[PDB]
């Protein structure tokens, strides 16, 4: 199970790049998918997005609260 980068979006179909291999993926379960998005694909369908930016933000937010509650 490898993630892919959306390089093309045309209606309910996207072109996803998995390590240099590009395949067409159905977007019915992730309608707001757009070029640049990183998605998890299962049996030809994108089932969820991967946002490292978001994840890093939540982490930093959490650290900031703990750092502040502890004394730094």
């Amino acid at each position: 199970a490898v993630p892919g980068k959306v390089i093309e979006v045309n209606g309910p179909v996207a072109v996803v790049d998995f390590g240099g291999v590009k395949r067409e993926v159905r977007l019915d379960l992730m309608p707001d998918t757009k070029p640049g998005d990183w998605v998890i694909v299962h049996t030809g369908f994108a089932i969820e997005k991967l946002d490292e930016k978001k994840a890093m933000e939540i982490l930093e937010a959490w650290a900031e609260v703990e750092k502040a509650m502890e004394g730094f």
Binding site: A1, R26, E48, L50, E52
Partner: protein, 371 residues
């Protein structure tokens, strides 16, 4: 470069393994952790995680293999429908996943159906079946559809598109299954585990919300986990701490891919076309409210709505000697099977657990586990 490198760093895996060991030292007894996902078992066996773990920490493999548990009755039934269709002049194109294609039954497999002259095509997803239906209006195209929530969602989506366009030569033989109800049953029938590694991809669909009742009702700690070895190692570490601190909650270690609410679009699509029913689980028995069938309003999308066949009674779920039932229940590993690696191999398999891509037996064989 794929985002989230930290989750696949070997150096991180080493620290996690070391951390797990420390926590285990101060563990009073033995902790038994179960997962119900073939992809998790693949990660675990491929990276030798069971070896890296303390003696008092065991990883049990549940029934996380949708093809393995597809009942024999349904496979044979699909075969009889293919024969009856031809006899009645209607020609059918049958699609199936690669492993289901070779799944054995006491009366033959879909591969045998092929060799007898039927159009049986191997596909990677329901969208393939769809195109095939498009390209062959003169033929009834049916996909033998097995799968847990992650595979049922794309089926639901495709059915939605077909119903809009009113495609009429696009059917499916529904043998979809639900995962949580199976965990509940295993819990009640004797499989002992103190913590659960909830399936990451299934959780993408049903969310953390879909697993919460198991914790509220049985007080068992859970961790929704991804599929990188660090995801699993992290989940194991977290389950140990919760077990030691006497906590009973669900932690979403796979936060980056799983929303608490899950995928609502997918959920509604599934609820629109499918309804929950009691269902059989090959080699395990009948699990209440664990299967999916098309609602009456959509009977026309189920191939069985068009052909009544009678499957011979008393077909055994497994060949004599196969312990796939014990393996699926987490009560035994493939190495605890006398046939494993001798009589039974991917090449000449005895049970479904060895044929399936997600099968624990195939996974053990593939990675040279001789144990």
């Amino acid at each position: 470069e794929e985002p989230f490198e930290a989750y696949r760093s070997r150096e991180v895996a080493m620290k996690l393994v070391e951390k797990i060991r420390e926590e285990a030292k101060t563990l009073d007894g033995e902790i038994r952790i179960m997962h119900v996902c073939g992809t998790h078992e693949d990660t675990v066996t491929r990276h030798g995680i069971r070896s890296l773990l303390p003696e008092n920490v065991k990883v049990v493999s549940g029934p996380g293999c949708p093809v393995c548990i597809t009942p024999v009755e349904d496979i044979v039934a699909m075969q009889l429908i293919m024969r009856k269709a031809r006899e009645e002049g209607e020609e059918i194109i049958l699609t199936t996943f690669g492993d289901m294609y070779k799944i054995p039954t006491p009366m033959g497999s879909f591969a045998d159906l092929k060799s007898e002259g039927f159009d049986v095509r191997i596909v990677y997803g329901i969208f393939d079946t769809y195109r095939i239906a498009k390209e062959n209006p003169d033929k009834t195209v049916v996909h033998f559809s097995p799968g847990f929530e992650t595979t049922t969602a794309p089926a639901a989506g495709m059915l939605n598109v077909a119903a809009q366009e009113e495609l009429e030569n696009f059917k499916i033989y529904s043998v979809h299954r639900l995962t949580p109800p199976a965990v509940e049953v295993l819990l009640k029938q004797g499989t002992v585990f103190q913590g659960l590694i909830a399936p990451g991809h299934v959780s993408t669909i049903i969310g953390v919300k879909g697993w919460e009742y198991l914790t509220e009702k049985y007080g068992i700690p859970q961790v929704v986990a991804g599929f990188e070895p660090n995801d699993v190692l992290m989940a194991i570490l977290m389950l140990i701490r919760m077990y030691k601190e006497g906590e009973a909650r669900i932690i979403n270690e796979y936060e980056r891919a799983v929303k608490y609410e899950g995928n609502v679009v997918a959920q509604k699509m599934i609820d629109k076309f499918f309804e929950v029913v009691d269902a059989k689980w090959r080699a395990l028995g009948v699990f209440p409210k664990s299967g999916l069938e098309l609602r009456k309003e959509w009977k026309d999308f189920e191939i069985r709505s068009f052909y009544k066949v009678e499957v011979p009674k008393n077909l055994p779920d497994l060949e004599k000697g196969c312990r796939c039932g014990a393996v699926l229940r987490g009560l035994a590993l493939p190495t605890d099977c006398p046939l494993f690696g001798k009589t039974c191999t991917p090449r000449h398999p005895v049970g479904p657990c060895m044929v399936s891509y997600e099968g624990t037996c195939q996974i053990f064989y593939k990675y040279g586990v001789l144990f």
